[PDB]
Ligand binder design. Structure first.
Ligand SMILES: Nc1ncnc2c1ncn2[C@@H]1O[C@H](COP(=O)(O)OP(=O)(O)OP(=O)(O)O)[C@@H](O)[C@H]1O
Ligand SMILES: Cn1c(=O)c2c(ncn2C)n(C)c1=O
Ligand SMILES: [Ca+2]
Ligand SMILES: [Zn+2]
Lengths: 606, 145
């Protein structure tokens, strides 16, 4: 470490003196650091935050600057672990609070699925909903995100259970890369299928060989990879959605009191389905609070007789159970039988299956599995997997969303086109039947206007697609009996059906695509030019160099707020400081005005 | 290099006529716009190729007999016999045709696949001609604007 050159000679000899004396001219740096650094870090973190607080609160203090320059090392070391939050409601002034952030929490935040959830949440909150419920949406996002990062950190019978759990965790971890592998193998199998020729038999031996065996291998490999993808999704993202649904129904029971006072409406099929889980054994399987049943019963039983409530929630009397446990805790343990019969709650499993099947992404994966099975039945069905690139890429997803964004108006315009084509059809059928002859030879004429159904189907199929209209696909009206009438007919058809209605139909989708692109660009611009927490203008921080960068990095940071919530949850309630306890009580009462939505620390003082 | 190749064959001097694009600002703007949205343009072209491939496999499986280009009663020129030929034909002809793929194939008078073939042609015209090609054109026009 003299070659390392981290200290001066005095510090080197001090470290030698404090070094473990092996009495054999040796030292064990592992045990040395384990003994010294950890208490040093845990105790000096408070010193570092004290110096940081003094520096931020006390400007233009030369002595304090000397202390900071002497303590540069500790501040630099603890800079990643130091988190800063601004709170408005504290004494009606903006106040800065400092806390500790774990490197494990930072890594879990950097996990890819957490980042994907973050970007989806930001898009949802910025594009729609405004800022009226922005704080509530942010708090819900924080709860779901900390649950997601806890799940990620989590990611002979005992041996096999451990092995299968490890396999499931591996699939959950490698869900995305295996998804890309599935896309690549789908592209390869489609490339192989491209060399197909009819002989009724669909012979693929266009080349010398080595195509059918590898095609079969790629098909079975694709099916296996798709099954593994669905397993990984089930063990990765299903817990998050079921946790969200359980939280929603539990909060409805607590605050709204849905299944207690007034039953959900019949149109609320989601509420009707959720009625099934409010009475099973493990209702809050993923929700952190397992006492929601006791809370709702203590809330409403004294008014509703406690008996209907006890029956509808199960478990009988929560108050009686709590009293019995408090008087004497159950001094026994239930042995885990190997061949235990129906240990799981069948009703809860049915509810979970219902919600995961109503989920959209799981439906897409089920469709992928079905397409793979149909591809095994007939190899040609693998072409449907080529549309996964639309999900993969954002622009293609934007086009697929735009094709349905204006669905109602598009359907109405198509209906109007059908109606006007029908009117032209009946006019032609009544007056211009003889002109619709497609027989090029003097053989039996092919009148398309003899029958109304045929005439209308012909009009819709041909006139709309034709650039010139209907007049370009029928005999010219040389006869003077209907010359001008037929010409006006054709011109009106061309004007109203070709260059107006079809133009509007095209413009609806093109404008939907443009509007979606503009919305995404506007979300990005807002994120770049305003602060999520407070909303102060970008220029005010730009008054100083990189002022907005600093404000969004350390002053108001979404990760910092999430880590502060995690810190409050992890800390013991008795150990909470004044500001921490106030914020915790506010979060419990669901008020959410501690966020400095109005002002900032700088506008408060400097 | 173009001048040297022009000495090798005088006809290579035609490539120098593109220097006006560098010379004038508006022409340079068009040449920059043709690549400003390059990533999205490539993605849209890929989506067009994918959808044309899907229509190709559908036609190959069900509507092979309609793709006859033999005007005389001589040996039929089936363009749908081979998948590679059918897909290349679709990409080359259906995209360029204003009416879609139904205007370059035999009309489905037979009742066995009348409605199926008509829906096929209408969907091809709607999704490939008046949507995807429109988006591809609009990308470059909007980049120029
Ligand atoms: N907590 C915040 N408050 C206010 N503005 C913020 C906050 N976090 C980020 N921003 C702003 O959002 C801009 C876009 O960066 P953002 O932090 O949203 O994405 P990123 O983390 O860099 O990207 P990615 O998720 O792709 O890795 C930043 O330049 C910053 O101005
Ligand atoms: C009170 N509380 C929470 O509020 C919480 C939590 N996990 C997430 N959240 C939001 N846990 C475990 C918890 O005890
Ligand atoms: Ca205390
Ligand atoms: Zn801010």
């Amino acid at each position: 470490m003299e070659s390392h050159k981290h200290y001066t000679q005095s510090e080197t000899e001090f470290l030698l003196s404090c070094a473990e004396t092996d009495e054999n001219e040796t030292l064990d740096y592992e045990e040395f650091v384990k003994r010294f650094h950890e208490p040093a870090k845990d105790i000096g973190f408070n010193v570092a935050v004290l110096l940081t607080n003094l520096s931020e609160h006390m400007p233009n203090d030369t002595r304090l600057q000397t202390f900071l320059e002497l303590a540069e090392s500790v501040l630099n070391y603890f800079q990643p672990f130091l988190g800063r939050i601004e709170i408005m409601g504290s004494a009606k002034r903006i106040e800065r609070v400092y806390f500790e952030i774990s490197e494990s929490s930072r890594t879990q935040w950097e996990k890819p699925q957490v980042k994907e959830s973050k970007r989806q949440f930001i898009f949802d909150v910025v594009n729609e909903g405004g800022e009226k419920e922005k704080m509530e949406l942010f708090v819900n996002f924080c709860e779901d995100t900390i649950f997601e990062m806890q799940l990620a950190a989590q990611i002979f019978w005992k041996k096999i259970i451990a092995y299968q759990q490890k396999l499931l965790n591996y699939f959950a971890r490698n869900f995305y890369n295996m998804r890309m592998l599935a896309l690549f193998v789908a592209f390869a199998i489609n490339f192989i299928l491209l060399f197909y020729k009819v002989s009724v038999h669909y012979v693929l031996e266009e080349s010398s060989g080595y195509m059918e065996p590898t095609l079969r291998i790629l098909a079975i490999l694709h099916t296996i990879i798709s099954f593994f993808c669905i397993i990984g999704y089930y063990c990765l993202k299903v817990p998050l959605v079921i946790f969200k649904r359980e939280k929603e129904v539990a909060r409805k029971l607590e605050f709204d009191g849905l299944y207690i006072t007034e039953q959900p409406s019949e149109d609320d099929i989601k509420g009707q389905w959720d009625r099934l889980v409010i009475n099973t054994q493990s209702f809050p399987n993923n929700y952190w609070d397992k006492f929601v049943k006791r809370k709702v019963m203590d809330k409403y039983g004294e008014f509703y007789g406690r008996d209907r409530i006890s029956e509808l929630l199960g478990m009988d009397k929560a108050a009686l159970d709590f009293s019995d446990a408090r008087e004497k805790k159950k001094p026994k343990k239930d042995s885990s039988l190997s061949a235990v019969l129906n240990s799981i709650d069948v009703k809860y499993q049915m509810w979970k299956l219902g919600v995961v099947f109503t989920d959209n992404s799981f439906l897409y994966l089920a469709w992928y599995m079905t397409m793979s099975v149909l591809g095994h039945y007939n190899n040609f069905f693998f072409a449907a997997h080529l549309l996964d690139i639309a999900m993969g890429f954002k622009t293609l997803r934007t086009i697929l969303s735009s094709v349905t964004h204006n669905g109602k108006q598009l359907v109405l315009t198509v209906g109007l086109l059908a109606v006007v084509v029908y009117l032209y059809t009946v006019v032609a059928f009544n007056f211009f039947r003889k002109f619709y002859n497609k027989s090029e030879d003097g053989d039996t004429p092919d009148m398309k206007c003899d029958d109304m159904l045929t005439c209308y189907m012909f009009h819709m199929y041909v006139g709309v697609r034709a650039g010139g209209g209907i007049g370009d696909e029928i005999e010219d009206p040389a006869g003077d009996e209907y010359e001008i009438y037929r010409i006006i007919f054709d011109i009106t058809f061309f004007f109203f059906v070709i260059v107006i209605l079809l133009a509007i139909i095209q413009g609806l989708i093109i404008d939907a695509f443009g509007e979606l692109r503009d919305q995404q660009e506007q979300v990005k611009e807002d994120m770049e030019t305003k602060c999520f927490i407070c909303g102060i203008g970008n220029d005010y921080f730009d008054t100083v160099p990189h002022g907005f960068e600093t404000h969004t990095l350390q002053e108001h940071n979404l990760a910092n707020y999430l880590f502060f919530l995690m810190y409050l949850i992890n800390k013991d309630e008795t150990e909470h400081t004044g500001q921490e306890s106030y914020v915790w009580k506010m979060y419990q009462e669901r008020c959410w005005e501690f966020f400095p939505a109005g002002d900032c620390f700088r506008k408060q003082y400097e």
